[PDB]
């Protein structure tokens, strides 16, 4: 189920709670929000404020607020005022481009990875009425490429160009409280380094936490996918792909990973908790001169309905400017060899 919003890349996307509208950045300083009308897409909003390309967009469901970050180093939280979106500036206190951003589940703070080699955890103080932020610096040595929050809204996973997937703690007591002990550790003060991959290869293009967040997976440039299990002393299972690097990854269950990247199509990975072994059971895009829906690298992939616990539909945007919607069950019927989890 493919739709082309344009022939240039979709830098990133974000959906509202009802999956009624989607935010996209088309290689632009802008953010276009489309809404569905029957079976057509209609542009309804245009968020112009960034003076640089938007590299990350996240939509907080309940509070219905949009957060964006660009190469101009800024980050505006967008609030809906009747018929318009108003941006509120948020000083990230960085000197390089912001590369990514994600609201926390509790919607009380959002994180921004950047080329300043730090992650900016932002939150609001209803006291002095504005957005502040603390930095998680050490031991980050390069640009942070991707973020994902743990369900408890405190732990944070990060993949950066220093070939590492790490889990920190963005505990901001000014807006929440003593995180409940996790298999990832009891002590969780701010910025504490909870976990860190060991391979010194491939930029970590994308990282993702499981539904309960006791498992974390990430895809690197060395064409490999990994999943570290917190119920197994953080053991890490790796599967070296025979094809090009994956740029995005997400759990569709507690043992099924779906990813896409430079090969231009989604694939399925399954985790065998017992043997602690990842397996490839993928390629869901089964049928310019390409036999795949997207005609350029797929750079993002989000869960559309069913959570990461039992995903039913998932979205993929890519450098071709296309947006695809994939139905998990639908796929299970078109391919008999399919095995979720």
């Amino acid at each position: 189920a493919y739709h082309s919003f344009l022939v240039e890349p979709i830098s990133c996307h974000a959906w509202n709670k009802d999956r009624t509208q989607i935010a996209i950045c088309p290689n632009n300083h802008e953010v276009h929000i489309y809404e569905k009308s029957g079976n057509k897409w209609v542009q309804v909003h245009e968020l112009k404020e960034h003076n640089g390309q938007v590299t990350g967009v996240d939509w907080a469901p309940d509070s219905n607020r949009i957060v964006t970050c660009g190469t101009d180093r800024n980050a505006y939280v967008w609030t809906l005022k009747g018929r318009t979106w108003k941006p509120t500036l948020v000083i990230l206190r960085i000197n390089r481009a912001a590369r990514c951003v994600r609201w926390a589940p509790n919607e009380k703070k959002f994180a921004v990875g950047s080329g300043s080699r730090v992650i900016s955890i932002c939150y609001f103080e209803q006291e002095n009425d504005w957005w502040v932020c603390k930095h998680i610096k050490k031991p980050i040595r390069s640009t942070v490429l991707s973020l994902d929050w743990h369900p408890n809204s405190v732990l944070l996973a990060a993949g950066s160009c220093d070939f590492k997937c790490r889990i920190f703690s963005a505990y901001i007591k000014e807006v929440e409280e003593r995180p409940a002990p996790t298999p990832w550790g009891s002590k969780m003060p701010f910025g504490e380094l909870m976990f860190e991959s060991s391979s010194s290869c491939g930029w970590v293009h994308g990282v993702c936490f499981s539904a309960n967040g006791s498992r974390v997976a990430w895809v690197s440039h060395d064409s490999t996918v990994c999943l570290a299990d917190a119920d197994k002393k953080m053991a890490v299972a790796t599967l070296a792909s025979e094809t090009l690097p994956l740029l995005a990854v997400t759990f569709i269950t507690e043992s099924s990973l779906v990813a896409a990247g430079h090969d231009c199509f989604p694939v399925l990975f399954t985790y065998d908790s017992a043997a602690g072994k990842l397996s490839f059971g993928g390629r869901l895009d089964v049928p310019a001169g390409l036999d795949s829906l997207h005609k350029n690298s797929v750079s993002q992939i989000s869960v559309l309905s069913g959570g990461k616990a039992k995903c039913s539909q998932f979205c993929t945007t890519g450098m071709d400017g296309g947006m695809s919607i994939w139905d998990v069950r639908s796929l299970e019927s078109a391919l008999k060899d399919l095995k979720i989890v």
């Binding site: 022939v7 310019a288 005609k295 071709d320």
Partner: protein
Amino acid sequence: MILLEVNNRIIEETLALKFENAAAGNKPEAVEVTFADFDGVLYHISNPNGDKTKVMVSISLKFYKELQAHGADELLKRVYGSYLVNPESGYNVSLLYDLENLPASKDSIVHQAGMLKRNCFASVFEKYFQFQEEGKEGENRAVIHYRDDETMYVESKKDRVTVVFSTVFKDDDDVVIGKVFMQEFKEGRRASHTAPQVLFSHREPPLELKDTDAAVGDNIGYITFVLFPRHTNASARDNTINLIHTFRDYLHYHIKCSKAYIHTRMRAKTSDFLKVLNRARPD
């Protein structure tokens, strides 16, 4: 155009226009012209002393003394007779034409004026062609520095006369292309066995010139034409002369035209490449 022409169009056209207006009885327009020819030749056409009823065509060659020392003067006299006059300061030979005293047919004189350059060269070849004929061997060789850094050597033997050109290729790549041409000249007889034999030394001069101050350098090249009696006799002489004296320019004229052609090939190839490269866009 493959072979280079011999006559000089500016000389002939200029003269003609003056000769026409002359016949038509019109009043003479003043004329003052400066121009060149291949190999450092400079000409001048003007009204001597401002007398617009006279037209002088002078030629200047930095190496005239050399040709003078081999019959130049005598030959020019035969060819131009009363048109030949005292040379204009700065030039070696001057032709004068009285606009009020032209022949019935002007084609002979116009054609001959256009061949001034060639006739200045003619004598040196005739002199040595005549040596071969009389079997007069052992005669010293003529050394003509037609260019500042290029030399022609003429010599006669028992049954053959040799012309050797010491040419220079400024552009290091022109040497390489020249080689392709010279190769074809050496084998030129495989299609004409009676034609002159051609030799080429990348750049050690022929042995006959090792003790001479002959040039020796990566960009230098020696060409040797072996002319036989059938080419040097009173029946072939003129034509043979018309070709031989234009060789060095012929060679270089074709090295440049080749590059021009390689260029049209590169335009086409690059043009294709750009299309393929752009069909690479989602349109």
